Curated annotation (Swiss-Prot), chain F:
Source organism, top-level taxon: Eukaryota
Subcellular location: Cytoplasm, Cytoskeleton
Disease: Charcot-Marie-Tooth disease, axonal, type 2O: An axonal form of Charcot-Marie-Tooth disease, a disorder of the peripheral nervous system, characterized by progressive weakness and atrophy, initially of the peroneal muscles and later of the distal muscles of the arms. Charcot-Marie-Tooth disease is classified in two main groups on the basis of electrophysiologic properties and histopathology: primary peripheral demyelinating neuropathies (designated CMT1 when they are dominantly inherited) and primary peripheral axonal neuropathies (CMT2).
Known function: Cytoplasmic dynein 1 acts as a motor for the intracellular retrograde motility of vesicles and organelles along microtubules. Dynein has ATPase activity; the force-producing power stroke is thought to occur on release of ADP. Plays a role in mitotic spindle assembly and metaphase plate congression.
The protein's name in its UniProt record: Cytoplasmic dynein 1 heavy chain 1
Portion held of the full protein: 3631 to 3679 of 4646
Swiss-Prot record, chain H:
Residue ranges, annotated region (Interaction with DCX): 276-318
Modified-residue entries (Phosphoserine), positions: S18
Principal subcellular localization: cytoplasm
Upper taxonomic lineage: Eukaryota, Metazoa, Chordata, Craniata, Vertebrata
Single GO cellular component term: kinetochore
Organism per entry: Homo sapiens (Human)
Outcome of swapping H58R: In LIS1; abrogates interaction with NDE1 and reduces neuronal migration in vitro
Name of the protein: Platelet-activating factor acetylhydrolase IB subunit beta
Cited function: Regulatory subunit (beta subunit) of the cytosolic type I platelet-activating factor (PAF) acetylhydrolase (PAF-AH (I)), an enzyme that catalyzes the hydrolyze of the acetyl group at the sn-2 position of PAF and its analogs and participates in PAF inactivation. Regulates the PAF-AH (I) activity in a catalytic dimer composition-dependent manner. Required for proper activation of Rho GTPases and actin polymerization at the leading edge of locomoting cerebellar neurons and postmigratory hippocampal neurons in response to calcium influx triggered via NMDA receptors.
Region of interest called Interaction with NDEL1, as start-end residue ranges on this chain: 297-319
GO BP annotation list: acrosome assembly; actin cytoskeleton organization; adult locomotory behavior; ameboidal-type cell migration; auditory receptor cell development; brain morphogenesis; cerebral cortex development; cerebral cortex neuron differentiation
Subcellular location: Cytoplasm, Cytoskeleton; Cytoplasm, Cytoskeleton, Microtubule organizing center, Centrosome; Cytoplasm, Cytoskeleton, Spindle; Nucleus membrane
Similarity comment: family membership: Belongs to the WD repeat LIS1/nudF family.
WD repeats: 15-56, 57-96, 99-138, 141-180, 183-242, 245-286, 287-319
Keywords: Acetylation, Cell cycle, Cell division, Coiled coil, Cytoplasm, Cytoskeleton, Developmental protein, Differentiation, Disease variant, Lipid degradation, Lipid metabolism, Lissencephaly, Membrane, Microtubule, Mitosis, Neurogenesis, Nucleus, Phosphoprotein, Repeat, Transport, WD repeat
Amino acid sequence: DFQAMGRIFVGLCQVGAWGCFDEFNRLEERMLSAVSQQVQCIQEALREHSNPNYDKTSAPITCELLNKQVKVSPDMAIFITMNPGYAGRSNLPDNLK
Amino acid sequence: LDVPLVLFNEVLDHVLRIDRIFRQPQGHLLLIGVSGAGKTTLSRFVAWMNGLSVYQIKVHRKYTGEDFDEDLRTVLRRSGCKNEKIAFIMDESNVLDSGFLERMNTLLANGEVPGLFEGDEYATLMTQCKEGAQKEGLMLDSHEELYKWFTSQVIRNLHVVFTMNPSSEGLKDRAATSPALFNRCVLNWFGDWSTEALYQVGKEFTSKMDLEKPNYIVPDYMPVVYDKLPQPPSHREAIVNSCVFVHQTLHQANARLAKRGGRTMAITPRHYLDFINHYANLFHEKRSELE
Amino acid sequence: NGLSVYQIKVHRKYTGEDFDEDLRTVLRRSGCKNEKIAFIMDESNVLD
Amino acid sequence: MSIMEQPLDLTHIVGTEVKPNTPVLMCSVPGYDASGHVEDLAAEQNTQITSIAIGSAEGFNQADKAINTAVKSGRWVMLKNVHLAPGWLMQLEKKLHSLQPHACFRLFLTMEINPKVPVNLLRAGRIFVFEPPPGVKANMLRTFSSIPVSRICKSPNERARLYFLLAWFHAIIQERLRYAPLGWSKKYEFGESDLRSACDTVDTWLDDTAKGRQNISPDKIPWSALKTLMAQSIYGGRVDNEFDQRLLNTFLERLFTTRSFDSEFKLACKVDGHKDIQMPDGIRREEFVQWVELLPDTQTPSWLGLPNNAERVLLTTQGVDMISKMLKMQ
Amino acid sequence: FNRYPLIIDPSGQATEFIMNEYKDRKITRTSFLDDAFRKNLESALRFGNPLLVQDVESYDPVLNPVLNREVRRTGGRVLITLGDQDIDLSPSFVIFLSTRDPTVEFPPDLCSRVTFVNFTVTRSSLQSQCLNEVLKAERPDVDEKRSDLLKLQGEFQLRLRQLEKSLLQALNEVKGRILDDDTIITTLENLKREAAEVTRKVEETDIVMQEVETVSQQYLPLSTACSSIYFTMESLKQIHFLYQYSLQFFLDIYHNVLYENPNLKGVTDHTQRLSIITKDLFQVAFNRVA
Amino acid sequence: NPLLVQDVESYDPVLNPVLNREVRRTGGRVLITLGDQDIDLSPSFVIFL
Amino acid sequence: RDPKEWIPRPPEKYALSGHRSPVTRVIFHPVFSVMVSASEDATIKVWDYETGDFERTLKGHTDSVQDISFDHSGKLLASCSADMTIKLWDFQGFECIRTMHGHDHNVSSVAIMPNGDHIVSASRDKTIKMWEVQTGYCVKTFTGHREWVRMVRPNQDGTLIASCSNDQTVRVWVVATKECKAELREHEHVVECISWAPESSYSSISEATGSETKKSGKPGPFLLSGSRDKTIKMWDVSTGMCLMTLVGHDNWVRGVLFHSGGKFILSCADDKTLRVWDYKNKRCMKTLNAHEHFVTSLDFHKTAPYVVTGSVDQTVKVWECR
Amino acid sequence: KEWIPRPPEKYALSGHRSPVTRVIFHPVFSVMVSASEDATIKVWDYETGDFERTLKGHTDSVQDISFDHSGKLLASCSADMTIKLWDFQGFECIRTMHGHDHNVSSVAIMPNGDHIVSASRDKTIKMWEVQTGYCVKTFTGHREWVRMVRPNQDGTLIASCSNDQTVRVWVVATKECKAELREHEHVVECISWAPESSYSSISEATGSETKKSGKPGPFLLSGSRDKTIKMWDVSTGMCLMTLVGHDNWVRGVLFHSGGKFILSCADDKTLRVWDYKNKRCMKTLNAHEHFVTSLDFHKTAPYVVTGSVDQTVKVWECR
Ligand SMILES: Nc1ncnc2c1ncn2[C@@H]1O[C@H](COP(=O)(O)OP(=O)(O)O)[C@@H](O)[C@H]1O
């Protein structure tokens, strides 16, 4: 659900580890829509981490996850592995895709 | 209940049938017919005739399975422990969940729900059952024979009536979701009020109103609606025939509206009752004003 | 004084079992729930 | 009906024709989202917007709080993929009916076209349908309107030509989808995201090659880099058929070469049997946009490289289909 | 009504019509969505206060005894069993049910228990509304003239009815013969002279109605086209479920084409303005709907 | 509903709240606590023994 | 006048007296320089505390008015009365825009959430209810109190509500999920009044009780409760512990609150006195013979140095602070 | 303040079945009390014009009513020869002092709040104790019907006007008429003294010279049925200036709370506010369709009330 996925994202971002989420379409479609928000937040945090004007001496990059400010390590990434050929699997919303 | 009723042949037949069912052990009723046909009122009247206590669950928006379980527990305690004759009137609209149907299935068939009581409330049930066994003159100590006595008392005392509208697909689905409903219940098909019933209701209700026209000419081609209408109809008989025709006209109008694809609202006997009441009031008012 | 006033509601069918049940209620409230209770009773309430 | 081949002007409609009490229902066919459009609208109007994705109970809580704040502060609220909560949609409509918001308040409800969306909500708000642009000219217009003017007009003067070529390729590819067995092998999701990735790739490689110089040689443009990246990652990523990949490679090699900078370059060949599409000679954004707006109204699948008869039966169906709608609402 | 009315008004005009009718009786508006609906219902039942309840699609079954009038009379008191408690049902109590969804379905029992009152938009009513709107927008003086004269005719007809009734009452209350008491003759003469004055006032208001309608005839085709366009909009829902348009949508289109028209900045000819308004009505309707 | 009760020599000590009139105003006007139930006293009530 | 240290002084500024019945509660307008006081005669009289002149009476309640409260903007006034109704007053035009029923018995408290979109009320039927400001619908019903609930007061951020009751306890509830976060019971009698702790006081409280600094940085919301055992207990909501007990009142504590600067505790009691407590040393600094009868409520202005106190003697008094 | 009544009314209270004789204001509450000729004293909420209650103890027509400083007691007089004292907390008569033969016209509680003055047709003014009810001292010297009586601001000096054309000021301790004034053209009906805040405003209004003590001295005013309103000095007894312009018989006079204008009612169906220091304001405002009987000015609120023979009490805003 939203809470478990958010907690996993918090762990991945704090560690700085890659998240390979296999069978991502097995989630409920509403839960996919909700998770899209956290994925977008992580991606925008990484994007503004990547800009040249950022300096490591300044405040560390943080993101809003589950109503907390969590530092996002540059090394983390989110990977979803899916098989769209199975009937009954949820369809990812466009804002997530 | 201070609500007037119009008596005709079908009402007498139906109250006789309900009285027959209410006098048998483990006698349950499955009334099927259009809403507003008097099923609930007739059931309450017959229960009052036979000394049964009418119980209805007060369903609302926040009603859930636990409330239904509590109501069932109260009814079973009153029926078995207190040895009270109770008529459990329940409607299809009261069924908000399949758990409701499961509980009703078990209660109708076995006469008891195996695990409706646990813990402290099971102890309370056992104490009440012990008190009832003492009251009747029976000597029961252990829990199993007390529960057997409670089940026997519930079987002998509790009567359950389900009233529901005649939906064919709904009927087929209920034939499998609640099998006991078609085995442990006596199915009465009230249906809609017949043409004869409408004619009798109109005649009896408008008997007070004048509707007398000695110089009334019977048309050569009388648009007969009630089959048993006397061949030389009077003015009053013609008026009642016209009222029945109006009701059937509404039925055909809804039929054609649904056929074209529009949205329809079901016509009930209460529509006919409102129609005749309006006719009486308007007739009286217009006559008074004109005079 | 913050005391909860408790009076037994006797009637013609009030027996010793009812009195014991009322005593159990008062003791449960005053010993387990830490509720201060003033148990007011009249001589007329003593039917036995 | 001319107004409707133009790109949708959300700015004017939201500013003027939409009351604050009326939600902007934004229904899209599958493969399209409208979140980007209104996010850009809020960005260019300097209006704060709170975006919430529906799907969680705390999502509903955050929604209700955001609407409660914005109806007084006058900010904007987005709720995306609201078609997954029809009952909550009914409750939201009931809440919206009895409400007196700030004059600047706006609520956007992004959904796909779904039969489960409550009718009363649809009657409550104003509906906008987002779908593939009707024609190649319309698709070019939408692409050029979406991309900011300053983004195209950068230091290299060839960037505008590359952007026009990319827009034409996107339009051709996306319009080939209307003809499912012929244009491709299946309904691929060639959408705005692929276009944005392609634009970013073009910008990155052009900046890498042209070190801020005002002009660059047409042969010095990294044609191979762009061709391979589109064929493998950007537009070839969704391709799972060998022959679809071959067709994509054919289009990329026909378009993305130095010959595209020739004055006599032919975008299409013999569209009507005699005339063919001629590549614009302009070097700036405005010239390409004017050329796009000057395109003929008549469009045929020969613009896409498909045979001219490929649109016959489909059109016939729609024709008959049109009659069926007229004969159903008499 | 015999059964308590259930009103279906998407526009809501019936709602404040009901409020205005029962304002003097202190009618209370509530909803099934309110958790305190039981308290308001029992207060209205006890004190006989008119009640209006919205959002009937969330109907609370607790109203079943009230709608079925399952009252029990004992000791001169009419007891109604609301849930598990008895309430003395005041004879002045009345309840109205309202909803804004014309397409909502209802269970057959609720349909049996209530008298449905549907407020649909008819072609004639919409034509009249559009004609009044265009008259106000283009010829405000004619619009206010028509409003004032409708007020005047209402007052005059009420006065005529009152005078006729008073004349009959006077001729019916005489204790003897007319000429025995002169005050009767005074009253009859006064009533007759007032009737003559109101009749001449009615005649002059009628001729000014004649001129008002003969200047209003010019805009009738626009109103007919407006009604036709709106009903085509309503019929649009037959071809796709997404094509749901309300009356407020068409009225906003009409307001935009009337007042917010960029093509009426410098045009003053009434015929030219009417033609521009019609053309831009068609254009704006197509643009907004499509 | 004025009430007459016979056989007072079998007095039921349930009328003690009614006879002593230890009622409380507000929150429903006149409130009596009959046994465990918060009854609303009707001012027209009167009892005769 | 140290801008965070003034305390009231025995010389009163004005003794406003227009009420015909005991004054129940007195509140300050958050924005305007005006003050409001409800009484038991079903009246809500509005006074200007700078010049001490009556302005206007708000009426419409049938029975005694028990609580009045403002929103953040000061544009709406929520009031509750003994007639089982809660009225919302448009403070600009001074008309009751909405009346709310639903409480089964006397409504003894009312408060508007900080967001300004909800109204929380507590009534004698042992229930707390939440009402929408816009629609006036009851949306949530906090149950769990075993007796008459006397006051309800939300915190600064509006995520928690505290309720005192005749059941000897103070219950802290989470508004979002309706659960009972905490149940604080140390008073030996009925709890009358409660109050939350302003942010500017947390650190002070943290060093007043000797509580070590938490690694989170938030000391935890602190609550106060005056009760009829003549004691005022201050609690840590996070841990549920009574940080301290303040003793010295001679009778039931009717109102309690912090100094706006969070350095002192202002309280009033039926001993006819208003007391200023130095909770640094857990001892009462100052005592004022505020009124000639019971003191029912007090309010302390956020910025201006004024203290307004109501009383059963039908007199509302303004105190300059020096 | 510059509080001035305005032609538009707020409420025209009509509950009395008989002409209204006097209206007063409660000292602290938002309550106005009106006595009428039907032996009933009605109590109203002037802010919203809502009938509150009625007190029907008196036998004959009630003439004059008066509060105390605290507003907890209400002294009333009537033609039934008796003086009633009303407890204003529960609104029931608590002490009905008798005597003082024939119709009693006026009654007043001097600010000390322990004694009452009363005047009547029997040509004398009696003093009563609130606590006990015993007439302790009787003031004689008026040879005719004493109409209206008022004490000072500290319970030491009393003024009595009568049909005998003489206004007599009496001292509590010495029981002697220190000042007797016989100068009016026709019968004096209404009197009212000056508050503190007005004495200074008199000094430049008349040019009077301060004595050795420097205090201007206590002041009187008397309106007389000869359509003249004359303002007088307690210490000397000499005329300062006269107000003329009332069409008909004057019935009620009092000073503005700010001590700057003069507000008076008269049988001229109109209410007149007049300036005295520079004679600038001469505003005449029609108030009732019939004879206007009495009026009152609120101490702080911007409200005035008028009771008339038309059985109607009217409220005017002040602006
Ligand atoms: N025979 C009858 N004569 C008059 N009224 C009737 C009759 N039967 C039913 N009704 C009306 O129907 C109402 C009760 O309907 P009910 O029995 O609840 O419907 P259902 O049969 O669907 O349960 C009553 O208020 C009564 O007025």
